[PDB]
Design a protein around this nucleic acid. Structure first.
Ligand SMILES: NC[C@@H]1O[C@H](O[C@H]2[C@@H](O)[C@H](O[C@@H]3[C@@H](O)[C@H](N)C[C@H](N)[C@H]3O[C@H]3O[C@H](CO)[C@@H](O)[C@H](O)[C@H]3N)O[C@@H]2CO)[C@H](N)[C@@H](O)[C@@H]1O
Ligand SMILES: [Mg+2]
Ligand SMILES: [Mg+2]
Ligand SMILES: [Mg+2]
Ligand SMILES: [Mg+2]
Ligand SMILES: [Mg+2]
Ligand SMILES: [Mg+2]
Ligand SMILES: [Mg+2]
Ligand SMILES: [Mg+2]
Ligand SMILES: [Mg+2]
Ligand SMILES: [Mg+2]
Ligand SMILES: [Mg+2]
Ligand SMILES: [Mg+2]
Ligand SMILES: [Mg+2]
Ligand SMILES: [Mg+2]
Ligand SMILES: [Mg+2]
Ligand SMILES: [Mg+2]
Ligand SMILES: [Mg+2]
Ligand SMILES: [Mg+2]
Ligand SMILES: [Mg+2]
Ligand SMILES: [Mg+2]
Ligand SMILES: [Mg+2]
Ligand SMILES: [Mg+2]
Ligand SMILES: [Mg+2]
Ligand SMILES: [Mg+2]
Ligand SMILES: [Mg+2]
Ligand SMILES: [Mg+2]
Ligand SMILES: [Mg+2]
Ligand SMILES: [Mg+2]
Ligand SMILES: [Mg+2]
Ligand SMILES: [Mg+2]
Ligand SMILES: [Mg+2]
Ligand SMILES: [Mg+2]
Ligand SMILES: [Mg+2]
Ligand SMILES: [Mg+2]
Ligand SMILES: [Mg+2]
Ligand SMILES: [Mg+2]
Ligand SMILES: [Mg+2]
Ligand SMILES: [Mg+2]
Ligand SMILES: [Mg+2]
Ligand SMILES: [Mg+2]
Ligand SMILES: [Mg+2]
Ligand SMILES: [Mg+2]
Ligand SMILES: [Mg+2]
Ligand SMILES: [Mg+2]
Ligand SMILES: [Mg+2]
Ligand SMILES: [Mg+2]
Ligand SMILES: [Mg+2]
Ligand SMILES: [Mg+2]
Ligand SMILES: [Mg+2]
Ligand SMILES: [Mg+2]
Ligand SMILES: [Mg+2]
Ligand SMILES: [Mg+2]
Ligand SMILES: [Mg+2]
Ligand SMILES: [Mg+2]
Ligand SMILES: [Mg+2]
Ligand SMILES: [Mg+2]
Ligand SMILES: [Mg+2]
Ligand SMILES: [Mg+2]
Ligand SMILES: [Mg+2]
Ligand SMILES: [Mg+2]
Ligand SMILES: [Mg+2]
Ligand SMILES: [Mg+2]
Ligand SMILES: [Mg+2]
Ligand SMILES: [Mg+2]
Ligand SMILES: [Mg+2]
Ligand SMILES: [Mg+2]
Ligand SMILES: [Mg+2]
Ligand SMILES: [Mg+2]
Ligand SMILES: [Mg+2]
Ligand SMILES: [Mg+2]
Ligand SMILES: [Mg+2]
Ligand SMILES: [Mg+2]
Ligand SMILES: [Mg+2]
Ligand SMILES: [Mg+2]
Ligand SMILES: [Mg+2]
Ligand SMILES: [Mg+2]
Ligand SMILES: [Mg+2]
Ligand SMILES: [Mg+2]
Ligand SMILES: [Mg+2]
Ligand SMILES: [Mg+2]
Ligand SMILES: [Mg+2]
Ligand SMILES: [Mg+2]
Ligand SMILES: [Mg+2]
Ligand SMILES: [Mg+2]
Ligand SMILES: [Mg+2]
Ligand SMILES: [Mg+2]
Ligand SMILES: [Mg+2]
Ligand SMILES: [Mg+2]
Ligand SMILES: [Mg+2]
Ligand SMILES: [Mg+2]
Ligand SMILES: [Mg+2]
Ligand SMILES: [Mg+2]
Ligand SMILES: [Mg+2]
Ligand SMILES: [Mg+2]
Ligand SMILES: [Mg+2]
Ligand SMILES: [Mg+2]
Ligand SMILES: [Mg+2]
Ligand SMILES: [Mg+2]
Ligand SMILES: [Mg+2]
Ligand SMILES: [Mg+2]
Ligand SMILES: [Mg+2]
Ligand SMILES: [Mg+2]
Ligand SMILES: [Mg+2]
Ligand SMILES: [Mg+2]
Ligand SMILES: [Mg+2]
Ligand SMILES: [Mg+2]
Lengths: 48, 271
RNA sequence: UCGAUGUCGGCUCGUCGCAUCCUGGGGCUGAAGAAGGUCCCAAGGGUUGGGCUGUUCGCCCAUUAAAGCGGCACGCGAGCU
RNA sequence: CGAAUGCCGGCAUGAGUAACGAUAAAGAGGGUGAGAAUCCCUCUCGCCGUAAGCCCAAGGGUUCCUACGCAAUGGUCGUCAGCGUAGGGUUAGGCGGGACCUAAGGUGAAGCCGAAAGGCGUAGCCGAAGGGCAGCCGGUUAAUAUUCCGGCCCUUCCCGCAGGUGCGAUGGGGGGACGCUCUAGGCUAGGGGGACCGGAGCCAUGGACGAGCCCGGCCAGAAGCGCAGGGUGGGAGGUAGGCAAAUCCGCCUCCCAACAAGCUCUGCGUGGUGGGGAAGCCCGGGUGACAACCCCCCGAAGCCAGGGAGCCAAGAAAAGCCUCUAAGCACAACCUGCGGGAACCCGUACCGCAAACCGACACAGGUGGGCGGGUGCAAGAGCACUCAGGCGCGCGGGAGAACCCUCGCCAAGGAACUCUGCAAGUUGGCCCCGUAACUUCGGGAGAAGGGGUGCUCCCUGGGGUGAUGAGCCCCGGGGAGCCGCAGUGAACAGGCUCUGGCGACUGUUUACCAAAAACACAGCUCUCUGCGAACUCGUAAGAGGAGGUAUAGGGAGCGACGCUUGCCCGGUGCCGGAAGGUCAAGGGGAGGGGUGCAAGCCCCGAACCGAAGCCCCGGUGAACGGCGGCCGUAACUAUAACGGUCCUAAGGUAGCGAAAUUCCUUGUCGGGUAAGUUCCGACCUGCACGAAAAGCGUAACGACCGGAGCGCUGUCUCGGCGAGGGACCCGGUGAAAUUGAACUGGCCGUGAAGAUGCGGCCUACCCGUGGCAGGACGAAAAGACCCCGUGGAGCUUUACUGCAGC
RNA sequence: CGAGCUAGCCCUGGCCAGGGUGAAGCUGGGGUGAGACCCAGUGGAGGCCCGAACCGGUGGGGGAUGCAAACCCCUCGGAUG
RNA sequence: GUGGUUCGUGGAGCCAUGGGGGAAUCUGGGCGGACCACCGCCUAAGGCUAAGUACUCCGGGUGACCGAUAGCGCACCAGUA
RNA sequence: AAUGUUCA
RNA sequence: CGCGGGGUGGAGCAGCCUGGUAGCUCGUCGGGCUCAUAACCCGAAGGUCGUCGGUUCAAAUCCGGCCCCCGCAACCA
RNA sequence: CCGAGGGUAGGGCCCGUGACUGGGGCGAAGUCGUAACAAGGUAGCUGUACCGGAAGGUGCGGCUGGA
RNA sequence: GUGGGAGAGGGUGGUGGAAUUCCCGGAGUAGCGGUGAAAUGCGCAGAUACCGGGAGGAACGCCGAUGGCGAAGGCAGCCACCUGGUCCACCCGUGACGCUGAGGCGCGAAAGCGUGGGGAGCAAACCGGAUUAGAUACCCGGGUAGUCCACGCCCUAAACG
């Protein structure tokens, strides 16, 4: 039956995007924490 | 009159609708910078702040003239009497001799063809606006202004009206639709006559939907909810409030006066 | 027995106890006969179909030689409902 | 370290067991190869066919094509593959996006607010399956194509040039521009026939050389040309409006003219011409060919489109586009021609109802748009069969036990089954007869109960298209006649009625145990709210309410409609009371105290004046709410209209009543039944109905709950036979919970009170397989209930204490 | 950190085979002093009816280390709101 | 009103503040724990100022520190799969 | 300021 | 079995709590008005205060053992 | 073909009966009050509306068969 | 037909003042009110009484009659408009056209009912205070529907001469 994950490229970008993460101070902290832990992908890698 | 229907389907053996003859001679709006895209929306900045609104037929907004001292003395012919989705009252499309067209909340009696004008000089007859000071004590008027130059705000609902009770200083005493006795400045305009389309208070919605077409979604009762949702909610198997009747926010809802006490607005009221 | 022993009734499958409801013997009788009553020995085998109720239990209807009582975790839910 | 349902890892047990994932289905012959049920080819066979076939979006990212390969992945096999290695492969001025437009919303110069972070927010900017915009028919590749190529037809810009005109905005106006339901006339797509046109061929098996059988009879196409439509009055003067800048709009005024004309703009044929071109037969290609390429009929949901009619709930924006003038500039400049030139960026493979997307899986689940042929059935996208095209579901082979699942049938009976007709049967389409109470006059109605239904031949009426007439289709009407058990001969396809309860009705709900008498609902009443409304969100700014104004908006309860909705303001709440009582700061300082030699400086501090609140006074019930007891009494008895007395704020009215409410209770009568703890009707000592937490009713409605009947049945007496899929056997692959170790029997005792394991006695060769579930206090979950813990949460209030708010 | 599930609302698109019933209007006839009103005919209304797609999830059975952490078969409700 | 301090209203000063009233410039003005009086300390309502002090991403040196279930989560292509 | 047993 | 409420002239209710007094209404009795009855006027009688014990000097009254009475609660499974 | 009848199914009229229920007629001296007839001691009557053990009472209007 | 007359005949719109009640202002003080007598109730929160301003609803004094009008129910301030009947006179017109009226249709006080309005006084029900043996009544103090309008119903009567 109709499952939880229904992939939408634009939605993903607009939601968890780099720019998106940048606007909100909360997001800027995310980018901070991740960059500082060593993640290879700061943001959900998705190509268009 | 109101149109009634045979009982072919229930909910429609009780249903009734307006006599649209009054309108006629025009269904299409006077586009000419008369209607505007009108934004729907039962909430403000996210949260719903008025319950149960939403849905309801698409609607175009007709911009009407609620301050007529713009064209003092410039007379106009009454082009038509159209339908307005945004109100109980019907509007009248009136061409000015000027060439400029405007809309006015159609008073009762007004007819396509008649002439009309606003001003002090203006003759005391249906459709004409003038400062209350220049209106004969006793005459019925609608679309009254509250403070001068601030525009009309009283007696605009279908078939509503205010009557002049007499002057007294720079003010004139009006008995408002509600029935309250307020002193209103003499400079406040007001067009003569009643609001018109008084059969309105009589149309019987009929079915559960239709109340929907009017953008009103279902209103659920307090007791029906749970202790958390409302003060009335709770109690095993049907109960009687159990608290003095109250709103979901908790204030008493039967008889408790609410208007602000120290409001300067008083001093000019009496009813 | 609570780091769990599924609780009523029914259905299905029974088995046992016997303080015996039938059917076998028997002594009294206020036993003439045909009947019955009460006690004695004896379960080998029997111990119906419906109406009402979730009922067990009952109370009815129509029968019967009789339509017995009770134990088996008020037998039986890794058998069903 | 031996235990912590300990942690990590390894390996066991169950066990060669369950299972190998839709019961659409397979067989054989050839190949290939080390090896093939499983790969390739062929021939049979079966399944799908509004698809199980095509095309597009999303998401997926190479899976696409070719050559090699088989460890692992494909639940078996594998030579095969969506798998491994390698190499190819995606071409655009016109398709879709961007160098266009705006929606909700987002952002956000100004501007407002906020301890900071940050919140609103104007212009502007961003934002699209919506608006706007120029590409058709074929042909090619292993793999791309509206992209390359062919033919035909367009779009922008730039230059030169000839010929035109007051040219010219981010400004003005027009326009773009809009609903739902119902529809006319033409068309087109699509489809069906043809005695006509073209064709290789075929006469089988009893017959047929046949007006036979079989195959196929189109696509695109500028200008012009027709045929359908859509748009549209022309004039001439004034003008207080278009934040007047206009000869453009808009307003008045007046010659003419109008179910039109002309002018415009589409659609459709037609068109120079280009293109395609079966079946069959011979190896995707050839041949079929210089293939013919015509005529009727049906005909859209599509086109003409901004067509028309009706209705109430009254149906986006902006740009392009016309037009108007502003500065300006008139050498500019726009406009039309005509040739030359210029024409960027991104996507394009493949999957795409699924083995490539979301579900850990090559998962019987989920996933938006378009096409979706033919015959038959009243119609249809339904059902049955079938084209094209695609499949036979990634373990097989036998055996024909119980038992289970899905399915067919049954003597006689026909609900006796059972909590309950649960389930299954019966009925089923269409045409015609013909239908009751009751009702809100619509309905109840498909009431019920019946008859007809196939094919053959004859006569006969209307229509549409033609042309009036033949063909071709569309509706019919009447006679005779034939055959079967049976004619909607298969598939789709109501069982019916009577009487209660609840809610009026359609509708909503606990995604995954409740679809209901619950919620909602039209409608009734109460109450608040005069607009910077009340109310809601927010510290605020600000916003919703509402570009609304009590015929409006918020809160509450009841819940269509009908007839109605009584008494009690004692307490509680709310509304009203400029008096008094009390009351905090603050004002006021009689009076008193600490110090100084003092002037002083400090402290207390009474009268009295001091809000709201509470007190007090009064109102108020569709406001929280409440709405009695005990004695006696009639000329038989019974009973009590009547009387006494106590208490109250007042003592329950109409109506209903052993009820969704009645404990005693299966109350008592009556009805139904052979029998009725249920049901219906009555009664009324109502444990404990009762009037908007509404009372009593009500036609219609209901996958709601109860009681009866008729019909009909394996539900049952009572079980029997048969079918397919498992189970069983062989070959291939091969799990799981659980598990202290086991060499694991019965009885009567015993024991922590329910023993394979102690005692006694009694049976008992060792080991499996197919079955059944009594025990192993079997498994699974550190019992939900229960109690306990000075454990936790959610909820309430006249619990305490705070805070928001007022 | 989340409204790529679910709930509500906002903007913009799409979709709903085929049957049945036959309201209001109109049109003609009848009626009357004029009306009301009554007939036929046309017309095509409705949180109307049947029933696919589509949206559900009523009863039963199957399933329960599943095909599936809610599925399957029969049955059933809506289907211009 | 509050905050700070050991100071939780306490006899509660001092040092800070939101609100109200509101001076003086050395005969000025604050403090020495209510308040007075003496005695004594100090000069508010402007600003700057090394060093001693804190930490360890980084380089080095040591260790009665670990030795691949340890030691950082990573000794290995780990903030990866 | 209620009332007034029956048949004559 | 539990909680606590009521027992008084003939009727229905007081009085108990802060023991010394039984009070009200009704009726029953006699006497009046009437013609007579009712209403009314006048004036009286009437109570082991459910019962059986010890507290007191004294018990309707304080205390306990029953006896009819009246209510309320009886649950979780 | 018709056809007496027979069956099945739904209607219409009438008679009998029915727990129970509503009011009526009738039966020498039961119970409660006293509405009407004399201002019947609240003029009566009446249609209609609510209420009440009962006759009745009151509202609104009409009557004179009252003043 | 012509020419005159009288009338609260009917409908619609407008309007007048007295009066009752309430609101505001002013003044003023211990009672008011009610009855058979009282009480409930109203009033020291400033009532009654009197003055001034205002809202509002209903009804029409004097004229007024023993009167007029209509078919009946019924109809009373004044204005206008719309309109029904009726009488007199002239002797002109038509030329028996007449009368009644089963059924039908129209009207039809009051009460009552629906939808919306309106609400001063009055006032069923209803609550109080008395009066009474009782008093579900007469009396008194309050009070709702109703009375009032518009529209649609109801169609009865001592609709009586
Ligand atoms: N009278 C017959 C009708 O019914 C009622 O009348 C009935 C009663 O009123 C009347 O009862 C009366 C009673 O009123 C009066 N006060 C006392 C009297 N003893 C009774 O009498 C009654 O009962 C007795 C037996 O006891 C019988 O013998 C006698 O016939 C009978 N009428 O008896 C009548 C029965 O017939 C109406 N009031 C009357 O108007 C009506 O016409
Ligand atoms: Mg935001
Ligand atoms: Mg609701
Ligand atoms: Mg919540
Ligand atoms: Mg709460
Ligand atoms: Mg309850
Ligand atoms: Mg236990
Ligand atoms: Mg255990
Ligand atoms: Mg037994
Ligand atoms: Mg024995
Ligand atoms: Mg079980
Ligand atoms: Mg099991
Ligand atoms: Mg274990
Ligand atoms: Mg392990
Ligand atoms: Mg197997
Ligand atoms: Mg097939
Ligand atoms: Mg893509
Ligand atoms: Mg393999
Ligand atoms: Mg590959
Ligand atoms: Mg560029
Ligand atoms: Mg912002
Ligand atoms: Mg853009
Ligand atoms: Mg677009
Ligand atoms: Mg357009
Ligand atoms: Mg074609
Ligand atoms: Mg042959
Ligand atoms: Mg053809
Ligand atoms: Mg062509
Ligand atoms: Mg034309
Ligand atoms: Mg022109
Ligand atoms: Mg002009
Ligand atoms: Mg200008
Ligand atoms: Mg599709
Ligand atoms: Mg997958
Ligand atoms: Mg994948
Ligand atoms: Mg899963
Ligand atoms: Mg799948
Ligand atoms: Mg099908
Ligand atoms: Mg598969
Ligand atoms: Mg398979
Ligand atoms: Mg049978
Ligand atoms: Mg048979
Ligand atoms: Mg039975
Ligand atoms: Mg049985
Ligand atoms: Mg039963
Ligand atoms: Mg069934
Ligand atoms: Mg069918
Ligand atoms: Mg029915
Ligand atoms: Mg319902
Ligand atoms: Mg349901
Ligand atoms: Mg209602
Ligand atoms: Mg309710
Ligand atoms: Mg009260
Ligand atoms: Mg003080
Ligand atoms: Mg002081
Ligand atoms: Mg006060
Ligand atoms: Mg007696
Ligand atoms: Mg007698
Ligand atoms: Mg009663
Ligand atoms: Mg009973
Ligand atoms: Mg009953
Ligand atoms: Mg019985
Ligand atoms: Mg009530
Ligand atoms: Mg109800
Ligand atoms: Mg239902
Ligand atoms: Mg339903
Ligand atoms: Mg039923
Ligand atoms: Mg069977
Ligand atoms: Mg078999
Ligand atoms: Mg095997
Ligand atoms: Mg033992
Ligand atoms: Mg042993
Ligand atoms: Mg075995
Ligand atoms: Mg088993
Ligand atoms: Mg535990
Ligand atoms: Mg404790
Ligand atoms: Mg969403
Ligand atoms: Mg018609
Ligand atoms: Mg429907
Ligand atoms: Mg269905
Ligand atoms: Mg339907
Ligand atoms: Mg300094
Ligand atoms: Mg070491
Ligand atoms: Mg490690
Ligand atoms: Mg090692
Ligand atoms: Mg007598
Ligand atoms: Mg006698
Ligand atoms: Mg009868
Ligand atoms: Mg009398
Ligand atoms: Mg009298
Ligand atoms: Mg009288
Ligand atoms: Mg009365
Ligand atoms: Mg009278
Ligand atoms: Mg009038
Ligand atoms: Mg005053
Ligand atoms: Mg005055
Ligand atoms: Mg008036
Ligand atoms: Mg006249
Ligand atoms: Mg003459
Ligand atoms: Mg009346
Ligand atoms: Mg009324
Ligand atoms: Mg009064
Ligand atoms: Mg009175
Ligand atoms: Mg009423
Ligand atoms: Mg009037
Ligand atoms: Mg009327
Ligand atoms: Mg009348």
């Amino acid at each position: 039956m109709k499952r939880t994950w229904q992939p939408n490229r634009r939605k993903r970008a607009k939601t968890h995007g780099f720019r998106a993460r940048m606007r909100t101070p909360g997001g800027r902290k995310v980018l901070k924490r991740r960059r500082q832990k060593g993640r290879w992908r700061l943001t959900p890698a998705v190509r268009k | 009159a109101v149109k009634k229907f045979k009982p072919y389907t229930p909910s429609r053996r009780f249903m009734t609708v307006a006599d649209f003859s009054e309108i006629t001679k025009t269904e299409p709006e006077k586009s000419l910078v008369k209607p505007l895209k009108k934004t729907g929306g039962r909430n403000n900045q996210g949260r719903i702040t008025v319950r149960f609104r939403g849905g309801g037929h698409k609607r175009l907004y007709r911009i009407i003239d609620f301050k007529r001292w713009d064209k003092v003395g410039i007379p106009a012919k009454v082009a038509a009497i159209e339908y307005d989705p945004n109100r109980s009252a019907r509007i009248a499309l009136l061409h000015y001799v000027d060439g400029e067209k405007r809309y006015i909340i159609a008073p009762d009696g007004l007819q396509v063809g008649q002439q009309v004008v606003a001003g002090p000089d203006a003759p005391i007859q249906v459709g004409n606006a003038l400062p209350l000071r220049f209106i004969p004590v006793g005459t019925v008027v609608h679309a009254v202004e509250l403070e001068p130059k601030k525009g009309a705000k009283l007696a605009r609902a279908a078939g509503t009206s205010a009557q002049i009770q007499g002057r007294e200083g720079d003010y004139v005493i009006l008995r408002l639709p509600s029935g309250e006795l307020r002193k209103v400045h003499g400079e406040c305009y007001a067009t003569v006559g009643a609001v018109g389309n008084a059969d309105h208070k009589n149309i019987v919605l009929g079915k559960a939907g239709r109340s929907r077409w009017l953008g009103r979604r279902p209103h659920v009762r307090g007791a029906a909810m749970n202790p958390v949702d409302h003060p009335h909610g709770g109690g095993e198997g049907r109960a009687p409030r159990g608290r003095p009747p109250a709103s979901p926010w908790g204030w008493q809802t039967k008889g408790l006066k609410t208007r602000k006490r120290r409001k300067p607005s008083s001093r000019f009221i009496i009813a």
